[model samples]
Target: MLTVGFEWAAQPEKYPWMYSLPSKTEDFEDWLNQWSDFTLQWFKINKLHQISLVELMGEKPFSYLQNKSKALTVIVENLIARNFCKYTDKEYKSIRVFWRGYRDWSEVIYNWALKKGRTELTFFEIIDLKESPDNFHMLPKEDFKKIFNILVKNKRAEWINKKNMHIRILFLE
Candidate 1:
């Protein structure tokens, strides 16, 4: 049996452009439930040994240490060293390319909206990370763009300018 620790926190500075998972206690439980389900499914799909969350420090099954960043770093390092999770260069490159394209498209749409005197535009929805394009190691750029356009045409993904220097993308479905 492989033992691992999982913890989630808001690190706004680390990933300013992307939305962070829930940090509030009110929303964390729901988020954790979803993540727990996803984690279980991932393990099953990968045919990996199942592990249970145990209370190591507090009431919560996973640690909620104050030094979230360091704690996460240690946990991930240990998991990798123990071969609990495998990382690959190919997968890393794939994720890099995907994010690069997303950023490029976002910038293009943002500028287009600005020129058209429109402060809002829709692109994609916030889905489960495991089910997201980010997980598709070999997702084609054209396919991603195609789905993005479809979402825009169907008005399912929209961007809203809530305030100056603040933009948000929302998914209707």
Candidate 2:
């Protein structure tokens, strides 16, 4: 996310790093470190929660957060960088860096639900996915319900339980 401040913009010399970096892509580690620094500074100044930050940036907050998380970003970047030469799409150039981590997190959650026999649980009950014992920390809000519609369209989650304004999802095995 980009922010404009009169002081920084006016004193370009003080913000040389922003100007020097390529608009497209950079070395994974360097880009990530710089992005982390930028995000931390952003959070500090904004004093906003993750959802608010995403709204201000006009981008998906969860995906942005996932891209910032150190544990996920590091391993994802390494794997993507190794295959950079084979990538053709410009967008994929940077995103592939963390795609694996995103996918891995998704699989982890799905497996956890299946293993615990909670695959049939309703959407509200899925909150159990985040509680203790399960202890599954979610990726980002964007990731939540991300694939649900896909499941619905494909007739996988055919019967969704709705009551008292709470929605429950039932996935077809």
Candidate 3:
């Protein structure tokens, strides 16, 4: 057997520490913490950034909350507040999720430029990088703004055009 990439489970319990949904009138924080953690993992394993409700059908945790009308709203808001994801649509229904802290991403991104010899590029170009699917590649343009901001702030990267979202990577480290 050639074990290669990875394995994934549709059930949250298989991963560990699976908690059952609470009674309608219950603690939101604890529930939110577990719910958010599972949701994030689901996205990561599936290589997805957008949170479509349809995907929730396969996950038991969200299934348990289907009757709770305010469940999605409360959980989504918490994810946004913590920078795990943000709404991409004007109607506030579309969501783009992201993992990892922006500070950690600074190194992850800048090192990519340094090692791969990618010096000058645009935000859009970064997303277009399909030749080698990497952690930062295909990262949402709006979401990467924070990562780019960190690079520029620390002199690790410079902007070619502010409006065009172009950047010139500078290897200082």
Candidate lDDT (C-alpha), each:
0.37, 0.40, 0.66
Number of the top TM-score candidate? 3
Q: What pairs collide in candidate 3?
A: none
lDDT string for model 2 (53-166, tens) is: 224334322233332344234433543455421222444322311222334444555556667766454444554454522233433344445544444444544444433212
lDDT of 1 at 22: 58
* Candidate 2 ranges with C-alpha deviation above 4 Å: 1-33, 37-106, 128-143, 153-157, 162-173
User: Which 10 consecutive positions of candidate 2 have the poorest summed lDDT?
Assistant: 92-101
For candidate 3, the C-alpha RMSD (Å) to the true structure equals: 6.5
| Over 4 Å off, model 1 | 1-19, 50-173
TM-score of 1: 0.21
TM-score of 3: 0.66
Winner of 1 and 3 under TM-score: 3
> TM-score for all predictions?
0.21, 0.32, 0.66
Task: Quote the lDDT for 154 in model 3.
Answer: 90
For model 3, residues 1-173, the per-residue Cα lDDT tens digits are 11111221254345332334355554556667656666677677666767555555445656644444466666778888888888778776567877666787678777767788888867777777774334567566666888888889998889888788788888665
